Amino acid sequence: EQESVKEFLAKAKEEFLKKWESPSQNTAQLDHFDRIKTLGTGSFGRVMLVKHKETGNHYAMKILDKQKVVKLKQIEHTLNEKRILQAVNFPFLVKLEFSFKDNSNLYMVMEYVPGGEMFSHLRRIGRFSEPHARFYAAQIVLTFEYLHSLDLIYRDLKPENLLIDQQGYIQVTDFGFAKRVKGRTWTLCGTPEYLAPEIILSKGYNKAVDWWALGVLIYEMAAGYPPFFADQPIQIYEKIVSGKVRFPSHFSSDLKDLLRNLLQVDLTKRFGNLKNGVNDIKNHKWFATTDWIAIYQRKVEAPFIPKFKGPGDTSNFDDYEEEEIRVSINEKCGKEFTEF
């Protein structure tokens, strides 16, 4: 029912805004945790598996080096990622359990999502069948519906940021580039293959960029490679803005029609950006078999359930070089990160 969604999103905004205005802080400390293994990396640092000593529960702890964050001009992005993570609440968004800081680092302790990145499963299998791709895409559609209702643009959709949980469902991680923007914004950010043309062209843009990125994701899931690629980012950008795209011969007609409407250079024609908003995507023929409520309630049988031996199993993650975690005797960058 339309009225049910409206009431849900209104209650969701009220709760989001309460936490947005009074964020939590310093809900743990470092010696409560054993460090186990690096799980992955990004533009803001490393994420490690840790074990809570008191309980034995495992977590994924994002560690940010305050001096490095300041050197790289990431103060606002880092504070904002933590503010967002402590304020949102949605089945397909990774949950923040604790956050705290010390003399050297900021720490975001997330629920550990043990099934690995979508990225690795996709590269391993090659490509996902359309039903498999559609299962994941439906979760992203609902997640963007939620985020956009809060005026949040995500801006970094890609398989690397989509973690598979024990039920086979997605958890979106890494809000380092997300922004609360009612109108338009201008920052050049994202990952080259997934950038919408209006970003590349240095236009003011809005939440429509996430819908373009959905098109890129659906294409890459179903084809095994993204729609626009090349040796160098600049060459990727020329393809993106060209308004041309080619599809594998095994793509269904319904899939191609959806992708033509998501990978639409003209903002006045892009699905998700029209007067009917997300419903143009939800009602598209390619999603005809999708039970949106059952996806949200996680009652659909997942196409793929990852293997987990037990607490702290890391088999679904690649190995990375391990470094020490140093805490300095001197407080670094205290004023900069007061609000963390």
């Binding site: 950010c189 950038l195 095994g224």
Partner: peptide, 18 residues
């Protein structure tokens, strides 16, 4: 093929934000 062209791009691994 397009797959071959993807391999030739060298961008088949994990991708960083700009």
């Amino acid at each position: 093929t397009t797959y071959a062209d993807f391999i030739a791009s060298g961008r088949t691994g994990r991708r960083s934000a700009i």
